[model samples]
Target chain A: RSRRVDVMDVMNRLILAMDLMNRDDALRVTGEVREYIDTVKIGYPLVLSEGMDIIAEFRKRFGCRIIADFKVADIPETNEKICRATFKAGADAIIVHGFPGADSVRACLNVAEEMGREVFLLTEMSHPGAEMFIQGAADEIARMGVDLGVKNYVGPSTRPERLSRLREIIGQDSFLISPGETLRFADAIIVGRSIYLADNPAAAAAGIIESI
Target chain B: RSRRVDVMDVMNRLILAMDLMNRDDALRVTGEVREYIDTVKIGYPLVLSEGMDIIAEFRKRFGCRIIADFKVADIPETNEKICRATFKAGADAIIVHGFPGADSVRACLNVAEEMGREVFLLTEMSHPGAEMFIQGAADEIARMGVDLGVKNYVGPSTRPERLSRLREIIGQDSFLISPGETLRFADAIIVGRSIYLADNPAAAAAGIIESI
Candidate 1:
């Protein structure tokens, strides 16, 4: 059977390629080849170092979707406050860690419901140490997240092998955000140093999109 | 022999009492009663929420020493970067979590040496779950910290009733920062919502100082 494709799914696959080869200079390259890529994922390191100012800068420059990869994990009240803050900062989507507890996930979802913002739940990570916790604790947390009606999950490409399993467990309809150098079955791909550090980021990004 | 009372020590005890009582709103109230306080320890929540901008704001408004309680524990390069960032953010002293690894502590100390920043090691936490890991881990980490020549150590209350044998096990000169409502031998205390959210914040703060 032929697989159905969507704009978001294609974008996710493109992000994987963009992340692997794009370096810090990718911004300049992306600007030079503006039509190829419109959206960007601002990961934790960038946001933590630069603060909310970067979000405004990106919005002004890109005029497209900006995902804040904060992976926030806290109490319900705190999560609500953080989600509100991220939205105020002009984020299109905000990432929250599901493992913090049910209240936290519900808090984020509530904020998303009220503000019309999007939330991505961290289900798995790219790092090797991710398995020991993500497979067990994160899985349980994801289950709680589903109970809370969360519709998105952040799974890494390094563990693409688990994509089918995750889809089966969480349901294929739930959005999947794959972060890392490679993109598998992710609904959205979060790229960072891979695309930012590349020599010719625009061409590299385009090539990545073509491959995916 | 009678102990020579240290002004900083007395100040820390007062702060500790204030912190224990003020977990949330009390933090701001404690700041209002600055005459009785010396140093303000900025914990993970405050720092993460407000960012380094609060450091300068607090200094301009209150004119007290700022302690960046980051509890940073990471690889060598990341540790060095955080130390420099904390120092640049105008922190008089920075808290480093010793659990990361010996190399992390060494790297942080090296950064402190290069940047002239004071590094305080977190020996233990006041939370209930602390005993499970902290009791056995404290001594080993503290030994590594002392070997690195760190003079300050953070833990719970030094009162005999609360910690029992904690004070006896740790070094005397190692500056203690307690978290409980009682100050005991703490050089500084961190009060958050307890003092700030009281019926009369000034009165609560005064009571904390008088307790010390």
Candidate 2:
């Protein structure tokens, strides 16, 4: 079986998003922010350059929850392949988009379940046009998550009002994570550039960790 | 300017989708069907096992229009990086999921334009529940693709009727590709197991191409 995140990881409510330009900066930023954060989320940029070996690198350095921000979205067969590769890459969890249909969502979670890993569904996006694209689909996706037995999700950090609506739909049991800001309703927050790009990364993370 | 798939290059608008479970099978089947098809699509399974180098390998062996069916979906920066990596790996084009919103779609197109490759938007899925999730949103995504300057798209082979709808949204100029069938509406038909699984893969591909 794959490993599990520490029960006390990420203060059980915070994640350091490693959306850096390269693996060196990813390592440097995560190293600076690791003391203040218990989880590090890595995206595809460093994975493309450093390969899946970076998953092992983050696992060794952080020793907390290592979330592969794959944002998986594909058909059932394709979803299974990508999720399986991600687990084999050594991540304890993965983030997937909910728009590829229920089977796609179920396919990812099924892989996560079979591999003993966690899965988070992207109910909405954090980017600017997310309102037009991802916002309208949150309720249905949240219901689908519940139907598919998903326990974690990602919503727009920029919209606490919408996040709260998602928080209600998914209920308080499942953890809701937002990118960029901490919210009273959110169980966790994923801070990317604000933490990684800050002059004092550790201090920035420390300030946000205390916000919850 | 980005390169377009020549209408004359393809004898018929048919592509061999190498959605096989293994690379050996992918190569074996493609070798059999190479003379019958002008394009070959390599998806996540072989990619997870063989890496993106498979694109270059297929290019060298077949000398055809190689497509990396990566179904890429991530943040803008990550999408750009993955598509760039795919092109660098020698794919002429790529398939990206429209679930990640316009920025992710535009980010991929931007990279494709810079690298002189092609981008296809996944307007709908082929699986059963696809109608419940992707169908309602495909028109807007198709419009979003046009607004973002995308010239290629993917629709369901299972729903030949809807492919025409996408054809209309993107206009008669842009190309539409479908998996599982050869339809008059689709500019390209992606056949996977039907050809790859058959005993005489070449004959199967020849039959499909003749139907076109």
Candidate 3:
């Protein structure tokens, strides 16, 4: 019940996707949006550029649940290692692909559950052409995700009506995160350039927080 | 017609996936398998482990089409840059994910064509759980790959029966590469542990080369 409240409290908040080339730029972006956003989404761009060390630095400075958005797609053995590696680097949550099947998801969840870390399953991408497969097979994908006891999903907010439909499928218990602004359906909006590319990254986020 | 013949000329030849954590172990593995395998594949494991220099160093000595297997998955801007960077480091080809839609694939292929490099479209993965989404939607994914007119493909060789089906769908013109030994289907087989973990890594590859 308390956890539900916590998720609800985080609803409508933006996740700052620190998709920068280096730590200096990442820190600069964080300097702007740190106070305004609820979570910082670190991706392969930053990880490959700055290494695992940047994960810990983000935690130390901002003290938020970092989402290591590697999309953690690989085989069972590789999946476990990648999840453990990201978590070891101080990520509170990580995303895995729903397309990889249950065994792979189980491998990631095994360590995630053991360590109290979170997992968000990628069902649909935000790109335009992504709808052909994901939306084309949304029901089956959602069922696969639900079977794994996943509580979070990623879908595009391109169509507001489509976002609400996905929200319905994932259920109120699950969080729907997408790349968008001023979205009514998404529990969390993943903002990359909106904040990072802005002249005043944090001020942009601050502006959103005030509005919400 | 000549390109198609060139592909068959490369058939049944193994491509060593140098998935080592660092270039030291990768170089060691390659030293043994250089004569045995046809090409060397450098994934993120080694790239993030050793950086761009390893790409050039491997080609400098081995003089093969070194594959940079980042499994490149991102938007157009990020995808193009990743491909360029890997190519700049002296890669002959890079693998890109099909999930991000054709725009991402086009972005990669665009640069790849201009630079005379190749892009291998990931139609399926070689892992256990990856089949759920990939195999579940095999026809759709393969059709998409076919529509894109991609000349290269990746699918699981874990089950030889499954590999054959993927081959039929992708057709004779496209390249099919997988990670396994005993694969009669792949245009190129990507071996990691079979060579890297062997006491006589070079001899292990020597055995395969003689048979084919």
> Each model: TM-score of chain B?
0.80, 0.91, 0.89
Off by over 4 Å in 3: A1-212, B1-3, B6-12, B181-184
Model 1, span B131-189: residue lDDT tens = 79876687777777777777677776434453433444455545666664333444556
- lDDT (CA) per prediction: 0.64, 0.78, 0.75
- Model 2, A14-71: lDDT tens digits are 7888888588878887887767777788888879887898898888877767888989
* Residue B20 shift from truth in candidate 1, angstroms: 48
TM-score of chain B of 3: 0.89
The model with the greater lDDT, 2 or 3, is: 2
TM-scores of all predicted structures: 0.45, 0.49, 0.49
For each of the candidates, give the backbone clash count.
35, 0, 3
Candidate order (lDDT): 2, 3, 1
Off by over 4 Å in 1: A1-13, A16-33, A181-184, B1-212
